[PDB]
Enzyme design. Structure first.
Site, PDB file in Angstrom:
ATOM      1  N   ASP A   7      -6.141  -7.678   5.552  1.00  0.00           N
ATOM      2  CA  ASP A   7      -6.131  -6.311   5.269  1.00  0.00           C
ATOM      3  C   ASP A   7      -7.572  -5.865   5.504  1.00  0.00           C
ATOM      4  O   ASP A   7      -8.617  -6.153   4.494  1.00  0.00           O
ATOM      5  CB  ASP A   7      -5.828  -6.232   3.674  1.00  0.00           C
ATOM      6  CG  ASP A   7      -5.898  -4.487   3.466  1.00  0.00           C
ATOM      7  OD1 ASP A   7      -6.118  -3.661   4.473  1.00  0.00           O
ATOM      8  OD2 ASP A   7      -5.604  -4.193   2.138  1.00  0.00           O
ATOM      9  N   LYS A  68     -14.000   2.287   9.406  1.00  0.00           N
ATOM     10  CA  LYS A  68     -12.787   2.367   9.639  1.00  0.00           C
ATOM     11  C   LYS A  68     -12.260   3.912   9.839  1.00  0.00           C
ATOM     12  O   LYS A  68     -11.408   4.171  10.686  1.00  0.00           O
ATOM     13  CB  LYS A  68     -11.815   1.877   8.552  1.00  0.00           C
ATOM     14  CG  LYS A  68     -10.332   1.717   8.927  1.00  0.00           C
ATOM     15  CD  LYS A  68      -9.620   1.007   7.760  1.00  0.00           C
ATOM     16  CE  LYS A  68      -8.006   1.278   7.624  1.00  0.00           C
ATOM     17  NZ  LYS A  68      -7.255   0.457   7.103  1.00  0.00           N
ATOM     18  N   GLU A 172       0.201  -1.293   8.076  1.00  0.00           N
ATOM     19  CA  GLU A 172      -0.044  -1.568   6.415  1.00  0.00           C
ATOM     20  C   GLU A 172       1.223  -1.352   5.550  1.00  0.00           C
ATOM     21  O   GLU A 172       1.632  -2.381   5.084  1.00  0.00           O
ATOM     22  CB  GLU A 172      -1.062  -0.785   5.880  1.00  0.00           C
ATOM     23  CG  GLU A 172      -2.601  -1.087   6.541  1.00  0.00           C
ATOM     24  CD  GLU A 172      -3.791  -0.203   6.284  1.00  0.00           C
ATOM     25  OE1 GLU A 172      -4.751  -0.241   7.027  1.00  0.00           O
ATOM     26  OE2 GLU A 172      -3.616   0.819   5.663  1.00  0.00           O
ATOM     27  N   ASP A 196       0.668   4.444  -1.340  1.00  0.00           N
ATOM     28  CA  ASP A 196      -0.663   3.557  -1.167  1.00  0.00           C
ATOM     29  C   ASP A 196      -1.830   4.565  -1.735  1.00  0.00           C
ATOM     30  O   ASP A 196      -2.220   5.276  -0.709  1.00  0.00           O
ATOM     31  CB  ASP A 196      -0.831   3.174   0.234  1.00  0.00           C
ATOM     32  CG  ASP A 196      -1.970   2.264   0.510  1.00  0.00           C
ATOM     33  OD1 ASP A 196      -2.751   2.315  -0.259  1.00  0.00           O
ATOM     34  OD2 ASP A 196      -2.122   1.513   1.260  1.00  0.00           O
TER      35      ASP A 196
END
Length: 539
Positions: A7, A68, A172, A196
């Site tokens: 991840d 990211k 994800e 999430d």
């Protein structure tokens, strides 16, 4: 030996491996099961992970994080231009691409986002190799469901630069669902909501899983919301409490504020398992000891708008997915902030008491799923695709939804597009796209002899019938005369592969907006023309 899941997270990354029938999340060299995604450049060295994060306040202009948020974007992307304003490090434009610019061993250096992320991935790789005592090459790396092709490819490149062979890039939320084995539940399709909530970002995803195929129905969220905000509410609370009690504002002193922030982060964690937490700081400011406490209820009140706000993206995703909340089969908690009891309660109440799947450590669940999928990839009757016919303007009108049980029969009534149309062309297509151009033609036939009538008067009944062996019989009947014609389409070829199906579903997702726009362009839904739209000359 085995491939690892990774991840690669916005604030931290996590790596895991499926071995001996079990996923193991792998601790790093400081004993931590997650590693900050941070890279720091100093006069003498390049730090990655914990070492990088721990010195940030000493070297902030040279300590890079949030790569990211840049990855796969263009310097002039509005998101980049907005994000840059909050980062202490420099981001510059190299021929249109953002690069982070830093001082390293006394020289100015710049790195593409994928290089930074590649450094984080090198760290995870090495972590994995220390644990496994062998080289790690193959990996599955996860990305947000909303990532586009550029972001996915740049994440893959980050992997390649790090010496990883990236077997697959997967979403994800999909990883999370795999972790809970929601794809092995096979039966009627299942609607899964992934909630999430991480340190810096909040993503909501609605997936429908049918026959081992994941389809993303919708995504929503807040790219700026996470645990740090909740911490910040407590920090400001305590600054105010100190000013009120001691008549001093500690904001002036950076270190005092840092110490407070650390204490509040710990306290917040305590408040997930206890109904109160104590804050004790020796000589916080001007030699004054700060020893106080905060209740869970008070923390919840300090956060009330942020917490209750998380339901808004859930609602929007449900709308965009055209699902009632009651239609959600599985709810999955991902990200550390879902540990917060108020969040869990808000969400369960919204869902009317429904049980949440929380049992897998929410920090690790994505890596967990990635590790499972990596293992599978290193080794470890229903309709495969929607079926329909072409209606005027080249649009795909679906008679049988993908993953319908067979045998099945489905009928719909259609009419003529223009006046005195003598016939209709029944063009049988298979695929998930809105326009037939983008689907596959399985066969065609004509129903002729239609008595002259104004456009929209004739009624042509079209029937799709699939027997137990999957042989598709398509027929059309003129309802005024009973006249009929039909075609038989042979399928079981083992002609489609699971990958083909995943591909088509994913492309249908990629193109959703364009498809919708083009879908609703045509006025009438049931009209049939006399010709093949895709053979009609255009400019």
């Amino acid at each position: 030996g085995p491939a690892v899941g990774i991840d690669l997270g916005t604030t931290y990354s996590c790596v895991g491996v499926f071995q001996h029938g079990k996923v193991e999340i792998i601790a790093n060299d400081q004993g931590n099961r997650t590693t900050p995604s941070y890279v720091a450049f100093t006069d003498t060295e390049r730090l990655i992970g914990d070492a990088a994060k721990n010195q940030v306040a000493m070297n902030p202009t040279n300590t890079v994080f949030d790569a990211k948020r840049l990855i796969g974007r263009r310097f002039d992307d509005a998101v980049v231009q907005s994000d840059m304003k909050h980062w202490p490090f420099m981001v510059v434009n190299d021929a249109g691409r953002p690069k982070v610019q830093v001082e390293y061993k006394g020289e100015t250096k710049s790195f593409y986002p994928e290089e930074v992320s590649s450094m984080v991935l090198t760290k995870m790789k090495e972590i994995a190799e220390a644990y496994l005592g062998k080289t790690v090459t193959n990996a599955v790396v996860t990305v947000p469901a909303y990532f586009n092709d550029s972001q996915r490819q740049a994440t893959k490149d980050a992997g390649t630069i790090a010496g990883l062979n990236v077997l697959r890039i997967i979403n994800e939320p999909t990883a999370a669902a795999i972790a809970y084995g929601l794809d092995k539940k096979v039966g009627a399709e299942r609607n899964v909501l992934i909630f999430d909530l991480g340190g810096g970002t909040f993503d909501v995803s609605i997936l429908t899983i049918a026959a081992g195929i994941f389809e993303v129905k919708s995504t929503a969220g807040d790219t700026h919301l996470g645990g740090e905000d909740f911490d910040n509410r407590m920090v400001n609370h305590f600054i105010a409490e100190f000013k009120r009690k001691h008549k001093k504002d500690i904001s002036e002193n950076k270190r005092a504020v840092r110490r407070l922030r650390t204490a509040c982060e710990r306290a917040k964690r305590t408040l997930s398992s206890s109904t109160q937490a104590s804050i004790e700081i020796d000589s916080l400011y001007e030699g004054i000891d700060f020893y106080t406490s905060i209740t869970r209820a008070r923390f919840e009140e300090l956060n009330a708008d942020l917490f209750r706000g998380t339901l808004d993206p859930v609602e929007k995703a449900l709308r965009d997915a055209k699902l009632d909340k009651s239609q959600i089969h599985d709810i999955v908690l991902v990200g550390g902030s879902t540990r917060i009891p108020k969040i869990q309660k808000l969400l369960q109440d919204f869902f009317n008491g429904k049980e949440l799947n929380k049992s897998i450590n929410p920090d690790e669940a994505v890596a967990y799923g990635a590790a499972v999928q990596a293992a599978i990839l290193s080794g470890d009757d229903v309709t495969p695709l929607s079926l329909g016919i072409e209606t005027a303007g080249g649009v795909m009108t679906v008679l049988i939804k993908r993953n319908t049980t067979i045998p099945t029969k489905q009928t719909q009534t259609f009419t003529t597009y223009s006046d005195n149309q003598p016939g209709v062309l029944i063009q049988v297509y298979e695929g998930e796209r809105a326009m037939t151009k983008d689907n596959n033609l399985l066969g065609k036939f004509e129903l002729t002899g239609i008595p002259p009538a104004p456009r929209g008067v004739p009624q042509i009944e079209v029937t799709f019938d699939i027997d137990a062996n999957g042989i598709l019989n398509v027929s059309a009947v003129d309802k005024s005369t009973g006249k009929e014609n039909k075609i038989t389409i042979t399928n079981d070829k083992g002609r489609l592969s699971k990958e083909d199906i995943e591909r088509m579903v994913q492309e249908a997702e990629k193109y959703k907006a364009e498809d919708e726009k083009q879908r609703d362009k045509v006025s009438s839904k049931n009209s049939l023309e006399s010709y093949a739209f895709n053979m009609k000359a255009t400019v």
